């Protein structure tokens, strides 16, 4: 999930655009 | 400003700001 | 703090805010 | 929507939920 990917790791451009509707 | 540590209310932040007028979905817990 | 006009990042708090461990959805422009 | 319902006019802690997970 998005926390694991952006939060406790480093997040990416691709990771926060898989989140927008 | 995406490629770094994102958590809480900063990680909100830069999904409204990279989504913009698509809106976002937020689930911290899956 | 919820029952006022929130509008752009505020609003975003707002449902951080409120929502907490649920996270939220928003969708703008529907 | 959330932004004609808590932007545009005046927003409700019932309003905000109904967007929440």
């Known amino acids: ?3 694991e ?3 406790a790791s480093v ?3 691709y990771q926060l655009e898989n989140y927008c509707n | 400003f995406v490629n770094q ?3 809480g209310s ?3 932040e830069a999904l409204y700001l990279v989504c ?3 809106g976002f979905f937020y689930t ?3």
């Open chain 1, 1 to 3: 999930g998005i926390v």
């Open chain 1, 5 to 7: 990917q952006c939060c």
């Open chain 1, 11 to 13: 997040c990416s451009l």
């Open chain 2, 5 to 7: 540590h994102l958590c």
């Open chain 2, 10 to 12: 900063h990680l909100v």
């Open chain 2, 20 to 22: 913009g007028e698509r």
């Open chain 2, 28 to 30: 911290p817990k899956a």
